Amino acid sequence: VPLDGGRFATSDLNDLYRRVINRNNRLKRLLDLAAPDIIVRNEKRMLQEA
Amino acid sequence: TPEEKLLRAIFGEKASDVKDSSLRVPNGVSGTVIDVQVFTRDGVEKDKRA
Amino acid sequence: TEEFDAIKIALASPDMIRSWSFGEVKKPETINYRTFKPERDGLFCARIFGPVKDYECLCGKYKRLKHRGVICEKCGVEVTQTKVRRERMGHIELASPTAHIWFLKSLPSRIGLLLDMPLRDIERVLYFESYVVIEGGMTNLERQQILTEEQYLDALEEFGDEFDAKMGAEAIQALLKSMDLEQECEQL
Amino acid sequence: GEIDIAKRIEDGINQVQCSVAEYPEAITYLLEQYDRVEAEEARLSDLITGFVDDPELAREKFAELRAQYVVTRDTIKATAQEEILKLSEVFKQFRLVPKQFDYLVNSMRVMMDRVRTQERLIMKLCVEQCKMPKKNFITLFTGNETSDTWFNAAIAMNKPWSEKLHDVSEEVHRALQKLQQIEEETGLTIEQVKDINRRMSIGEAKARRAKKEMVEANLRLVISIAKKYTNRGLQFLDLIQEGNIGLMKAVDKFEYRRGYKFSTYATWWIRQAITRSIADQARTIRIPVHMIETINKLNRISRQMLQEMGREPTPEELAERMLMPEDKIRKVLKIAKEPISMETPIGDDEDSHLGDFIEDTTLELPLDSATTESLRAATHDVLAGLTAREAKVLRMRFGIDMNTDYTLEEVGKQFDVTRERIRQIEAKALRKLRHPSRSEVLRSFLD
DNA sequence: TGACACGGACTCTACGAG
DNA sequence: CTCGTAGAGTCCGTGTCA
Ligand SMILES: [Zn+2]
C-alpha cells in the first residue's frame, strides 16, 4: 500500500518471494546454458536456502 | 450508482470534483488559537497570508 | 453461506496445488513505478489474481457493470469485485524439487525417521555436502549409504553402471518414491 | 579450455563409442548407419567428432573397420577377440548419430534394470531367510547369466532359499528367456557389458574433469571482481553467480583471432552481467537503467558539492550543476525511496509494528450503505407513485433495479415507438416530478 | 537468561553365549 | 569368564516460555 509521503510499506514475503523467483529464473537459464556442475550445485544450494 | 445518477439528472447537481480534507478541530477541545506558522517550499507562489 | 464442520488437513499433492492456483508468476516485477498499476505477470498481477479497482479491467476497455463476467481480450483480467484479490492463490513452477523444511528439522524428523537414516546424513545430502548411493546395483554398496566426494569419484571410475548416486533434494525424492511402505511394515 | 574441454567431451562420448563397439552386433548396425551416412543426407559430425590417438577419409577408415572386423570375425572363436577390442578403440574416434546411441544405451540400461528387478526379488527372497552375501550371487549368476543354469546352480549348491526358489521358478525362467531375446539382439552374453559400462564411465569421468577445469582455471577472478558490488541489496553469492554466468558467456564468445586482450574481454562481460543484474533485480520496483545512472550522477554531484561547500547543495544548486530541468531531479529523488519493512517496531513499545496502523480505505462506510438502501426504497415507491409505462421508461433509461442501461433508441424499440418521443417522455416525467412535496423527501439525500 | 524437557549420542556396566 | 551386545544414565545442544 502507498502510505502518504511517497514511501511504500510491504510485508517481508514480498522480498522472500522475489528472491526465490530470482533464483528460480537464474537456475532455469543456467540449465539452458549447461553450466558446469559446480555452478548448478551452488544454485540449487541457494534455492534450497531461500 | 444509477439511482444517484437519476437524482443528479433530476435536480441538476453538478458534482464537485474535489473532496474535502480540511484540518478541523479535534473533538471535544475548545480554546484560543494563539499563533499560526506557514511553511512554503521554495518556488511555489506564496499566498497573501504567508 | 454453507454450514460446515470437521476441518480436514493433509499433505498437498502437486496436482492439488496446481488445482488451486490460477496462474504462474514468471517474473519478479511488482508494479509499474510510473503509474503504480501492477506488472504482468509479476508478484502483483491483475490477469492472474484480479482487478485492482471494482468492476473495471486493467487496460480500461470495460468499466461498466454491463461487463461483469467478460474477460478483457487486451489485458487478460476478468472484471469482478476487488475482494477476489483476497482469495485467489498463485503458484510457481519450481525447477528443482525442494525439500519442505518442516518435515525435516522438526524434532521427530519425519523424512529422517521415514527413511530410517540418521538426520545428520540427510542435512549433509540436501545441502550438497555428500552424495548418497541410491540403489547401487550389483556392487558392494548399500542403498542408503552417504558417500563423500572422493568416495563417489573412485566409485564412478570403479562402478560405471548399476551405480546410482545423487545429491540433494533430488536424491531424497528418488529414495522416497521407491520405498515400499507395507512390505517394510510386514518385515518390521 | 573450451576447445580442450570439448575435446575431452568428445573423448568421453568416444569412450562410450568404444564401449558399444566392443559390444557385439553393434558393428553390424554401425556399418548400416555408415551406409546410411554415405548418401550424405547428414553431416560428418554425426559420425566423427574429433579423433583419439571429408567423405573419402571416413570411407577409407570404415573400409579398414570392415576389413579388420571381418578377418578377426572368421577366427574370432582368442586373440581375434582382443583385435575386436582394438577395433572398438580405433572406432572410439567416431561418434554415431545421437539417436542410435540413445537407443542402444537406453535398451541396455533398461534391460540391465529389468534383470536387476528379477535379481532384487531374488535378493529379497535370500535376505529374508538366508541373507545372501552379494559376492556369491555375482559369481554364480555372473559368467553365464544367460541360461537358467545358474538357477539350478543355485539349486546345485543345496542352499535352502536357493532350492526354495522354485516358488519363483516361473518368473525366473521368464526373465532368463527375455534375457535370451536380448542376447539374440546383441548375440552375446552380459559380463562384457560390465566391462563396457566401466569403460564408458571412465571416459565420461575424463570429460567431467576437463569441464571442471573450464572454471577451476578462471574461478577466483569472478570472486575478485565481485567484491566491488557489495552493497546493492544482493546476497554476495548471487553476485558471484551472475559473474560466473558472465564469465562463461565471455569464454564461449571469446575471440583470440579478433585481436583483443583476453582478460579485458572476460572482465568486460563480467561487469556487463553483474551491473545489469543489480540494476534490474536489486530494487523491488524495477526501474530503467538510465534512471539508475541518473541517481549515480546525482550522488556524485551531491558528494562533491557537499564536501566542498560544507553545508549542502540545494535542489536549485543541483539543477544548476546539471542541465536537467530539476523537475526530473525531484522526480528521481522521489523514485529512489525504498519501501520500509511493514514490521518496523515503533518506539519503546515492541508490541505493535507499522502494519498494525495502516487502515483500509477501500471499505465503503456503513453509513453510506444505509443511505443507499433508504434511497433505493424511496425511489422505488416514488416511481410507483407515477404512471406505469413512464415509470418503466425511467427505470430502463437508467439502471434502476435493472442491469445494463439501454440507450434511448433501444428502449423506444422496446415500446416500438423509437424516436425523439422517448426523450419527450423522459423530459415530461422529469418535469412532472419537479413539482415539490414529492421529491423534497428525496431532496434530503443531497448534501 | 533460566528453569525444563526432550532427543540424540556417547560411555560404562552387565548378561548371554561359546 | 570374557567378548560382544545390551541397557542405563548422562551430557550437550536445541526448542520453549516471559
Ligand atoms: Zn482491459
Swiss-Prot record, chain A:
Transmembrane region(s): none
Post-translational modification, as annotated: Acetylated on several lysine residues in the presence of glucose.
Record's description of how this protein is used: Co-administration of salinamide and rifampicin or salinamide and myxopyronin suppresses the emergence of resistance to both antibiotics.
Function: DNA-dependent RNA polymerase (RNAP) catalyzes the transcription of DNA into RNA using the four ribonucleoside triphosphates as substrates. Resistance to the antibiotics salinamide A, salinamide B, rifampicin, streptolydigin, CBR703, myxopyronin, and lipiarmycin can result from mutations in this protein.
Family from the record: Belongs to the RNA polymerase beta' chain family.
Oligomeric form and interacting partners: The RNAP catalytic core consists of 2 alpha, 1 beta, 1 beta' and 1 omega subunit. When a sigma factor is associated with the core the holoenzyme is formed, which can initiate transcription. The rRNA transcription and antitermination complex (rrnTAC) consists of RNAP, NusA, NusB, NusE (rpsJ), NusG, SubB, ribosomal protein S4, DNA and precursor rRNA; S4 is more flexible than other subunits.
UniProt name for this protein: DNA-directed RNA polymerase subunit beta'
Curated annotation (Swiss-Prot), chain B:
Highest taxon in the source lineage: Bacteria
Post-translational modification remark: Acetylated on several lysine residues in the presence of glucose.
Biotechnology: Co-administration of salinamide and rifampicin or salinamide and myxopyronin suppresses the emergence of resistance to both antibiotics.
Record text on subunit structure and interactions: The RNAP catalytic core consists of 2 alpha, 1 beta, 1 beta' and 1 omega subunit. When a sigma factor is associated with the core the holoenzyme is formed, which can initiate transcription. The rRNA transcription and antitermination complex (rrnTAC) consists of RNAP, NusA, NusB, NusE (rpsJ), NusG, SubB, ribosomal protein S4, DNA and precursor rRNA; S4 is more flexible than other subunits. In pull-down experiments interacts with CedA. (Microbial infection) Interacts (via flap domain) with Escherichia phage lambda antitermination protein Q; this interaction renders bacterial RNAP resistant to transcription pausing and allows it to read through termination signals.
Family, similarity comment: Belongs to the RNA polymerase beta chain family.
Function: DNA-dependent RNA polymerase (RNAP) catalyzes the transcription of DNA into RNA using the four ribonucleoside triphosphates as substrates.
Name the UniProt record assigns to this protein: DNA-directed RNA polymerase subunit beta
UniProt source species: Escherichia coli (strain K12)
Species lineage: Bacteria, Pseudomonadati, Pseudomonadota, Gammaproteobacteria, Enterobacterales
Gene responsible for this protein: rpoB
Stretch of the intact protein here: 896 to 945 of 1342
UniProtKB/Swiss-Prot annotation, chain C:
PTM info: Acetylated on several lysine residues in the presence of glucose.
Amino acids binding Zn(2+) 1: C57, C59, C72, C75
Uses, biotech or industry: Co-administration of salinamide and rifampicin or salinamide and myxopyronin suppresses the emergence of resistance to both antibiotics.
Subunit and interaction comment: The RNAP catalytic core consists of 2 alpha, 1 beta, 1 beta' and 1 omega subunit. When a sigma factor is associated with the core the holoenzyme is formed, which can initiate transcription. The rRNA transcription and antitermination complex (rrnTAC) consists of RNAP, NusA, NusB, NusE (rpsJ), NusG, SubB, ribosomal protein S4, DNA and precursor rRNA; S4 is more flexible than other subunits.
Similarity annotation: Belongs to the RNA polymerase beta' chain family.
Function: DNA-dependent RNA polymerase (RNAP) catalyzes the transcription of DNA into RNA using the four ribonucleoside triphosphates as substrates. Resistance to the antibiotics salinamide A, salinamide B, rifampicin, streptolydigin, CBR703, myxopyronin, and lipiarmycin can result from mutations in this protein.
Protein name: DNA-directed RNA polymerase subunit beta'
UniProt organism field: Escherichia coli (strain K12)
From Swiss-Prot, chain D:
Region listing for Sigma-70 factor domain-3, in residue ranges: 293-369
The entry's keywords: Cytoplasm, DNA-binding, Sigma factor, Transcription, Transcription regulation
Tree of life domain: Bacteria
Region described as Sigma-70 factor domain-4: spans on this chain: 382-435
Residue segments, region Interaction with anti-sigma factors: 419-434
Residue interval(s) of motif Interaction with polymerase core subunit RpoC: 238-241
DNA-binding region residue numbers: 408-427
Subcellular compartments: Cytoplasm
Keyword Transmembrane helix attributed: no
This protein's GO CC annotations: cytosol; cytosolic DNA-directed RNA polymerase complex; sigma factor antagonist complex
Main localization category: cytoplasm
GO molecular function: DNA binding; sigma factor activity
Site (Interaction with anti-sigma factors): R397
GO biological process: DNA-templated transcription initiation; negative regulation of DNA-templated transcription; regulation of DNA-templated transcription initiation; response to heat
Domain notes: Contains 4 domains, connected by flexible linkers. In the active conformation, the domains are in an extended conformation, each making extensive interactions with the RNA polymerase catalytic core.
Summary of the function given for this chain in its UniProt record: Sigma factors are initiation factors that promote the attachment of RNA polymerase to specific initiation sites and are then released. This sigma factor is the primary sigma factor during exponential growth. Preferentially transcribes genes associated with fast growth, such as ribosomal operons, other protein-synthesis related genes, rRNA- and tRNA-encoding genes and prfB.
Family per similarity comment: Belongs to the sigma-70 factor family. RpoD/SigA subfamily.
Protein name: RNA polymerase sigma factor RpoD
